[PDB]
């Protein structure tokens, strides 16, 4: 037997297939495997099965899909109402210009529109995982 180039290539393939599996394990300890680096944080897997895991939505991971859907629609309604009642209907610009003050309810509500967007995103993420 002499080591043909095909045999060397076979050793290359065997070595790479074994080592690529070994380095993923708890026995390689590379700086690229630290927290904040490539691997997910220990108790908080973000993506599994090609689907956003429940841990993505942070403190909302315990919320039900129905609860998140209700919160999403409610926040959408309230925030859209605030934006429409601040910009087009019931404008506050003239009132505040003459020394008045903003209708604080409108300002608080209008911030619930993007919150509602991300809330409905979280609702879909929860629904995918069956929660």
């Amino acid at each position: 037997y002499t080591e043909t180039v095909a045999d060397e290539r076979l050793f290359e393939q065997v070595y790479l297939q074994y080592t690529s599996e070994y380095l993923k394990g708890p026995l390689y300890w590379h700086p690229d495997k630290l927290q904040g680096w490539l691997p997910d944080y220990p108790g908080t897997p973000m993506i599994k099965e090609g689907k956003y895991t429940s841990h993505v939505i942070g403190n909302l991971k315990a919320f039900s899909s129905n609860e998140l859907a209700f919160l999403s629609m409610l926040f959408f309604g309230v925030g859209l109402y605030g934006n429409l009642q601040f910009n087009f209907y019931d404008p506050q610009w003239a009132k505040v210009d003459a020394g008045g003050f903003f209708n604080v309810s409108y300002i608080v509500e209008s911030f619930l529109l993007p919150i509602s967007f991300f809330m409905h995103i979280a609702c879909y993420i929860q629904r995918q995982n069956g929660k």
Partner: protein, 119 residues
Amino acid sequence: KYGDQRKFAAVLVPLTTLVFPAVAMGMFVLYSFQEDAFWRIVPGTKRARELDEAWREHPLFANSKDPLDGLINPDDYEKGLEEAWERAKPAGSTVTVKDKLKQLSKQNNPHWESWRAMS
């Protein structure tokens, strides 16, 4: 008067734009002939060797330059690799994992960092 600050100028301007620059140029050309000159960019300086050895003496940075550093249990890794190669060894092949890795680590590049021989 609006002048009377030129008493400071008549000393500072000649000083910092003639005496200091000339002294700096002379000191720089003197420094150019030290064995330590530009030791951070010029290869083969004594201080570079001492700094590298000082880093190697630190317990954390002993095996820092090794590209293969990290294997917590290299014996387990080698045993697993040998087992995986045994099941895939082609027919009556006479190559083992140990000597294969030993000869794959030993290359022939005599002219690599040969500048580590003067300082």
